[model samples]
Structure formats: structure tokens, C-alpha cells
Target: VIGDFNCTNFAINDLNTTVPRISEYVVDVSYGLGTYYILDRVYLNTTILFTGYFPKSGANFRDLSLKGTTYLSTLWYQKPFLSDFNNGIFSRVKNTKLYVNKTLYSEFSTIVIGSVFINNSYTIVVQPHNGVLEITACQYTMCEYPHTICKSKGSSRNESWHFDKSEPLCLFKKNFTYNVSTDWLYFHFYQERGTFYAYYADSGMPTTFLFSLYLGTLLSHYYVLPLTCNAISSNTDNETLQYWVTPLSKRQYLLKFDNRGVITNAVD
Candidate 1:
């Protein structure tokens, strides 16, 4: 996709701006990584995962994950649990007659069966399902199928669901356990990290003070903050949990991680 096919070149009329009607920068290889050209808007109702393949490492923004069927507690809504943070599930039940919490009941919808995403779109109508009823709609694009690691068979880890078993994988009590066991844990922060930046208009002493105070707002997002700057001190440094801010041309992401290297949450 090199070179901008200037609208004038094709006598195009659907434009967004005036002077910028054409692109300022040349279309290069790097642009291919993040750019997409939308063709005709085909609004069709289909119960299937459209996008495939996603990156797995290093501050990913648009990555998708799946829930595992480990904690039956979260399967049905019953208020929050104390240890729930360590492990819990989140899902809405489907059938009430079966007496199975609507979340656990099987229905015509997309789901994650183990690491693989399952789609019953072939059999179900192109509509949304409400109490076994179908309505024309597009399947949820935010749905995810995250990775699962099983350490030894028949372990206490409830996060590991039987892939061949009937249950679908989802988040629940076992997730928190895995979070703790795998060091996928994080600490909440009330303050902020010590980081700062400065800019000058024209000329000055380049006046600068500790930007750490202003950075505190960004620092409060981490679950774990190390106290010490260096390693091997008389005491374990709990203050090392300092800052982990990542900025992109598109968005400002508040970066926080659990022990497993996965960012559990974020702020705009």
C-alpha cells in the first residue's frame, strides 16, 4: 500500500477535511502496521469472532483474553467475595428452567472452550439470544480467549478447567489463586510514582524542580511498588514499586501488572 491514492487521482468526494484532503506524509511500510482502509460499510448480523490472531507480550492495547471455568462462585451473582479478588467468575446465566445459574447454562452464543474460542453461529440465528430467543445482531467483538497454563494434573489450581470437560473456561476464584501462586499479584496505590518532565518556551535558566510530586498521580496505578532503587540492602525495599507509565501516539495508558506479566486493568 505504498503511495497515497490521492482523492483527486480517483476523483473522490467523501472527504473529512479541506487542505488535509490528501495525506501530508507519504504512505510507507511502517504505516502498514497500524493503518487500515475501510471499504464499504457492510453491516451484517453474524454470531462469530471476526478478528483473528493477537499479540501476547509487552504493553499490548488491543489484545483479547478468555474467561476460564474455575470458580463456580462467580458463575452466579451472589455479591462479591473476600477471596474473590484472588479468584472469581463473571458471567450472565442463560436458561432459568434448568435451574442452573444463567451464567453456567449452555446457550446459543460464542464462548471460549479452553484456549480455543467456540462459535455456535452456524446453528444459531444471526440475532441476539434473550431467554432462548434470537435477535439480529453482531456478536460481541470484545470477547476474548486468554491463555491458560496448567501446572501438573489434578492440582489445587481451580483456574485450570478440563479442556475436554463440559464446562467453559472463565475467570473465578482460581484466577486469584493463580494470581498469587504464579506471582500474578499486584498492590494498589493511593499516591503516585516519582517521575517528571519539563519543557522551555524560548530561553531561561532551564528552571526545573522535582517533578516527582506531579508524577505521584501516575504512580498510584501500580499494585506493587518496590521501595529500594538498588538491590541487596539491609532490609527488603518495598518502595521499589515506583512508576510504569507508557504513552502511545493514540492513547495514554495507565500501566499496571500482576505477577503473570498481564496488565489486569488500565485508565484512559
Candidate 2:
């Protein structure tokens, strides 16, 4: 009946931070890309697999992913694998997962999946099962994950470690430098009464810094900077990691999350 007709295509250029529908549509144009929001319906052609869709990515903060049977037109998780650099499954296709050592099974996100937690001999292990990013029960762990912490105990002065993946410190091991791009580094000094500033270790030049701390059930003072110069300094020491920002920038972020064990974010 409609032989010479084709589907119409269109787009909206200018973006608005306040506009309603148009703004929402432009946001998640994919399969809950980094979200644990699995679907059992015929949504959109977002993922870059199915010959042209994208692959599933990892979220360090999320602990679950969608897993359902494919329905000719609908789909489920497939051909899963992880990318390098604590990155995600966003190159169109990738893999990520994690299983807690606790009672109920918890989903591991791509963000924290690569870093080894600071507790229990029981961690995560990879065992491919139906192409899904497997999250085996905690049982002493592996290389993909690191063995460090995001926050310390007591005061920033004395050091103690725990597993909180959202922290830049927990993203990688300390003392050893790995080539990566943080764009912005968030430093939590934990505790200090006076002004704290980060300077160029080599020339003692102060850099631009931001005061953004994440206060959950636990709270502490933190700093953020992208490093005005390399070869900065070393060891969080309590006093060392506390001094990175001077004058204090404009934006301040206080992240509040429920429970200290889970690595998720809620900004304030």
C-alpha cells in the first residue's frame, strides 16, 4: 500500500536544562545504559549489539543487571565482557558484574567491579555463564579488582580502610601510579580544623580546588582538583591528602547515601 514512502527522521538542536519532554528524551537514549533497570518490553534501538546495537556496560555503584530471555524483537543480556581503565560497557558493548559475600546476592557495578574491596576473604570471581558478567560469591579474589579503600577510620590523621567504591582513592591502589584520566580528583581529608590547600609539590604553587564532600551515615571534609601539574605529592597521610585546595572554589557537593557498605551516590 505504502510503496514509495519512508520513515521520517528529525532532531532538536538547542538543549535546555529546564525543558520537560524534549530534555528527558535526549537523556537516556539507550537500554538503561549504565543502569540496573532491566526491561521486558520492546523499547528502543539503543544498545549497539544485535549486529548494530551497543553492549552492556558496568556501573561500579549498581549491583544488579537485567537478565531475561530474548523475544524475537525484545532482548536480554548478551555477549558480555568488560573494557579497560575502570571504564564501562559503553563502547557500544562490554561486560561487568559483582556478588557480595553476604546473605542475599547483590549486583556489582562496573565502576567498583574492578577494585578489590577491603573486607572478607570472600570477594568476586569470573565464570562465564550464558555470556552474562558473572558475579560469583565472595571467596578470596582476583586481579581485575584492587585491594584498598575509599575512606579511613577515626580521623584523617590516623589511617584505616574500608570498601567504598565511589571514592577516587579506592579506584586504584596507592603508592603506585597508573596512567589514567580523572579530569577531577576528589580528596577527602577526613578531618582538619583549619584551611587546607594543595600545592604543586615541585614548585609549591597552589592549584584550583573545590570543596565537595560526601557525607553519608559518615561525613568528612574533602577536596577536588584535576591537578594543575603532575608529580604532585604522595601518601594520604591524613594531613597530606587534606591539603589540595586553596581559597575554596564555588561549587560544593555533599553526597548522602544510605548505609555505608554500598557504593552509591545521592547528591545534595
Candidate 3:
């Protein structure tokens, strides 16, 4: 008989069991966002009434349904990497070394470089100036590569691509694996311009505060573009809700919570 509480995270423990004083509820009237956590529920002491929730997507909270599910095989895809960069500017990955492999040296042979493996290897190497990425080799020693020159394809071997904050260069590409037979939910954040950018750096949950993405089991490692932000907030306009569901064993579906409706045969 109770109504919307407009709140969540009230469970008492990992078991998700609320105290008796708090469990006397009849229904979870909360509408579905992109995903469904146990935030809203019906806690009935007795089976006085049968209750259920419908899943769909809409502008309002009540019509926000589950949008069905999708099935996925062993496929490779790119997922967003979440992180915290204090100044909304992701400077070069700290404490990482850039190596000069034979192929890399041949591409930019004009510059003399040496090799130093004192740190980790990153996919995207950007030069930042005044909160924006520069158009040249801003680092005297691009990566710890000793005596080697970092250059773009047709440069003098001392210059690199000008990967500005507007469009940071993606120097590397890696594949990560995900599998789920049921519906799943994730988040996308909206921020002020130049507040979010990502490139390959190290391995770990994009949500973690760790430095490198190179220090974990191969199975647990994922390639997520590190996100940098000046500040983090959950104001309505700053967030978007997304969902992934598997309706079959071989295909999947996707629905966004921004009132854009749902799309079938989403993944190819």
C-alpha cells in the first residue's frame, strides 16, 4: 500500500535484507531506468496481493520498461572506460615507459631514440598544452624510449600528431570480452566540454582509481578509455542510462533511456 520513496541504497547488508521495521512494503513503484537494481521492491509480510512490474522504455518513470534482453556470443567490442582525472585534463599516463620497437623505429627513423622499460606501455600518447592537447612531440623523451624520435607518418621524425582535447588520437586498439544471458545496465556521463577523454593506458576497472591497466590477470584486464573530469556530479543532465539485454543465444538488443526508443538487431 506504500508509494514512491524517491530513495535507494537502503538495504541492510550484502544479503539485501531490510529490517522488519523497514520491510513492511507492498510494491516497488519506482520506474525502470536503463537498468534495474534492487532499489525499489515490494516487501510483503503475507501474500495478500499478487504484484509484478513491467519493463519498457519511455520518457516518464512508470513506463520505463526492461526493454527485453539480447544474447551475445564470444564477440569483441569497445566499452567506455571510467576514471577520475583531477583537472579534467588527462596528461600523459604517469610512470609509464614508451618502448621503441623495430616496427615503431622504422616508421619514425629520422629521430634517434633509446629504450627504457622502467614503466608501463600505453596506447595513446598525447601532448597537452594549456589544458589542450598539442600538435607536436611535447615531451623531450616521448615515452622512456632512449634516443628515439617520436614522429607522425610524414613528419621530420621529431614531431607527433597533434591530438588535441577536441579529438584525441586513438593510437591503440584492444579487445575485451563480455558475456551475459540476461539484461544488463551501465551508465554514460555527460560533462562540460573537454571534461571527458580517454585512451589506452592500463588495465583495471575503468571505475577504479588505479594508475596503469597493465597489472591484472589477462581475463580481468579490459581496454577502457580513461575518463578525465574536473568534477563528478549526478545531476540529471549529467547522466544517461543505457541497457543491454539478450533475447536469444546469438543476438542482443539495446535501449537507451533518453526517450530515443528501442532498437532491435542492435549488435552485428
Candidate 2 wrong stretches, greater than 4 Å: 1-32, 35-92, 95-119, 129-133, 141-268
**Off by more than 4 A, model 3:** 1-174, 197-268
lDDT scores of the candidates, listed in order: 0.18, 0.19, 0.19
Residue-level error in angstroms, candidate 2, position 108 = 16
Give the alpha carbon lDDT tens digit for every residue of 1-268 in model 2.
0011111112112222222211101112122221121122232323312111112222122111211111110111111112121211221111211222422221111112222232322222222221232223232222211111111111112111123334322211212121121111221111123222111111111111222122121211110111111111233221111111111122222222224221132111
Scanning candidate 3 in windows of ten residues, the lowest lDDT window is 62-71
Q: TM-scores for all candidates?
A: 0.14, 0.17, 0.16
Output the TM-score of candidate 2. 0.17
- Candidate 1's residue-wise lDDT over 51-139, tens digit each? 21111114322101111222222111111111111111111111111112332221112222111112221100111122222211111
* Global Cα lDDT for candidate 3: 0.19
How much is the lDDT of residue 198 in candidate 2? Answer: 16
Model with the higher TM-score, candidate 1 or 3: 3
Residue 131, candidate 1: alpha-carbon lDDT: 26
- Ranked by TM-score, the better of candidates 1 and 2 is 2
Worst lDDT window (10 residues) for model 1? 219-228
